[PDB]
């Protein structure tokens, strides 16, 4: 029933940079069967489907790239457990799409990123974002910081404290970044950190200036109320 459609989806999706309309329809059918949770053959075809979908993120057509991100988003929502071994690859592919020249692709990537941050293992996601936050270019680093915030909102105190030496250096550095969006994203991330460990965050912020501390505390007292 579905196995005959999948064969079509595979051979169609492997047609890179050709037959745009046929691949849109195949993507829509896949996405529809994911949302409806009618796809009973994820246990058989997930790996191949995912890899062909991630390769589709680099298509020439922006409408194809945007649609593939929407499909990826729904697969993340309904089959998050299957991304355990492809977590790193999916994260980097989703973040990379944020620097797309076309706004529809960037928007889809943002939607896919927000879902990804809650569909992935918390500890695993932080350890892959930390080097990205510190080294990547705008706005990929910005997207990585926002994703890290969503993850920290879903961890315990003990889990976060064991990951603090990896997280904090990037946020401190990011508070001094050129882009105001990155600086603002770092403040909001620190607020999320404070929401978990409380005043145990203070000694990690010994490097920050007085006014930078006052701006952070302004958003902290704003969040709890």
């Amino acid at each position: 029933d579905h196995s005959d459609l999948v064969a079509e989806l595979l051979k169609e999706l492997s047609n890179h940079n050709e037959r745009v309309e046929e691949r849109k329809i195949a993507l829509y059918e896949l996405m529809k069967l994911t949302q409806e949770e009618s796809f009973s053959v994820w246990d058989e075809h997930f790996k191949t489907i995912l890899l062909l979908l991630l390769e589709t993120l680099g298509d020439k057509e922006p409408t194809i790239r945007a649609l593939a991100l929407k499909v990826l988003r729904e697969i993340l929502r309904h089959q998050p457990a299957r991304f355990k071994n492809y977590a790193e690859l999916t994260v980097m592919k989703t973040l990379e799409a944020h620097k797309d020249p076309h706004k529809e692709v960037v928007r889809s990537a943002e939607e896919a990123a927000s879902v990804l941050a809650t569909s992935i293992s918390p500890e695993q996601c932080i350890k892959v974002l930390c080097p990205i936050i510190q080294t990547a270019d705008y706005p990929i680093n910005l997207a990585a910081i926002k994703m890290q915030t969503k993850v920290i909102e879903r961890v315990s105190k003990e889990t976060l404290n064991l990951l603090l030496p990896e997280i904090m250096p990037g946020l401190i550095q990011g508070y001094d970044n050129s882009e105001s969006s990155v600086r603002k994203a770092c403040v909001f991330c620190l607020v999320a950190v404070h929401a978990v460990i409380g005043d145990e965050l203070k000694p990690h912020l010994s490097q920050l200036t007085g006014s930078k501390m006052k701006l952070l505390n302004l958003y902290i007292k704003r969040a709890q109320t």
Partner: protein
């Protein structure tokens, strides 16, 4: 949209205090370095005495 502009104005309203604190941190690092240079040389002077 407006949240970004508020954040950017809060930074500006403390811009002067920001620069004085940055400069202070630089001066504090230089003093600390000079203090280590003195300790290093006083150790030599003490050793060269007897």
């Amino acid at each position: 949209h407006f949240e970004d502009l508020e954040f950017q104005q809060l930074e500006h309203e403390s811009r002067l205090d920001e620069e004085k604190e940055n400069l202070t941190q630089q001066l504090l690092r230089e003093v600390a370095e000079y203090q280590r240079n003195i300790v290093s040389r006083k150790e030599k002077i003490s050793a060269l005495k007897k």
